Amino acid sequence: GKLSEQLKHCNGILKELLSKKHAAYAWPFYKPVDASALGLHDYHDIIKHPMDLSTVKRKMENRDYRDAQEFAADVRLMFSNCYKYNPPDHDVVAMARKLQDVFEFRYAKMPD
Numbered sequence: 001g002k003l004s005e006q007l008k009h010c011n012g013i014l015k016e017l018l019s020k021k022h023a024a025y026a027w028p029f030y031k032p033v034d035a036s037a038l039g040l041h042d043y044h045d046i047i048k049h050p051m052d053l054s055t056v057k058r059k060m061e062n063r064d065y066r067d068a069q070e071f072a073a074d075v076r077l078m079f080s081n082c083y084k085y086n087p088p089d090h091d092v093v094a095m096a097r098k099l100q101d102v103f104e105f106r107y108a109k110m111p112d
């Protein structure tokens with residue numbers, strides 16, 4: 001159906017975001033932010049709903065997402081967390097912006 005087809009487009013986007021093509025700026029988003037490892041002892045006080053591409057991949061594989069909108073909400077939550085926690089001129093924010101550009105332009109090519 002339409003939902004299955006739209007979720008296949010989402011899975012295609014997810015595969016691209018995890019691909020070597022985008023690795024130079026995607027890598028901070030591959031796994032959950034390790035707040036303790038990075039010394040970010042305020043991270044989980046500021047970010048109430050952590051999200052990352054490994055979590056999106058697990059949710060896609062487990063058929064957690066019922067539609068494209070639900071998938072997109074998690075990918076955008078991941079970027080929003082980065083923009084909320086970090087100063088806007090930090091390298092990780094520049095990398096978030098670049099990966100979100102990849103995401104938004106391909107998400108816009110969703111089949112109707």
Ligand SMILES: CC(=O)Nc1c(F)cc(C(=O)N[C@H]2CC[C@H](O)CC2)cc1O[C@@H](C)c1ccccc1
Pocket residue numbers: 028029033038040081082085086087090091092095
């Ligand atoms: C997905 C994400 O956003 N991760 C992530 C993060 F939440 C915060 C910081 C970080 O160090 N923020 C600083 C902002 C200014 C404060 O005064 C000191 C903390 C770094 C992060 O990624 C590491 C791997 C990174 C490190 C360097 C370049 C790219 C990614």
